[PDB]
Amino acid sequence: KQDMPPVGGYGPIDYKRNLPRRGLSGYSMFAVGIGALLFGYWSMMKWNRERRRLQIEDFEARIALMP
Amino acid sequence: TYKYVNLREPSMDMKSVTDRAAQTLLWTELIRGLGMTLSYLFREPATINYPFEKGPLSP
Numbered sequence: 001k002q003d004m005p006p007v008g009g010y011g012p013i014d015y016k017r018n019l020p021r022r023g024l025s026g027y028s029m030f031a032v033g034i035g036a037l038l039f040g041y042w043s044m045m046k047w048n049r050e051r052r053r054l055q056i057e058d059f060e061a062r063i064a065l066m067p
Numbered sequence: 068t069y070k071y072v073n074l075r076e077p078s079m080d081m082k083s084v085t086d087r088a089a090q091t092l093l094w095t096e097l098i099r100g101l102g103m104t105l106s107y108l109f110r111e112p113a114t115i116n117y118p119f120e121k122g123p124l125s126p
Contacts, residue, residue, distance in 0.1 A: 023095065023099070025086050025089055025095060026082065026083075026085055026086045026089070027085060029089045029093060029095065030085075030089065030093070033093065
């Protein structure tokens, strides 16, 4: 008279299938990308242009000597 | 009875193609897919330390 099945206490667990979490898609991407990339080239032309100014100063000390 | 799996056409409109062309080109899969599901290393490893610890059995 000592046998298994309980009178109660059950679930069940699902048979389902779901993890579609979105996700920042669909014109949200391709907009943060271009907005990041244009910040890069804007951070250029303030350094590459400025290094071009110090470049001429480096040639300047050459030319003021050599006679 | 039945069940049909992988029997569905794409939507094929203007909206959801950009949802799929963000996938192939800028990888919204394959990082959200398996740069996160793997790590997930932060669980405790389950190794029986054999010369000292031993495993369960039954009478």
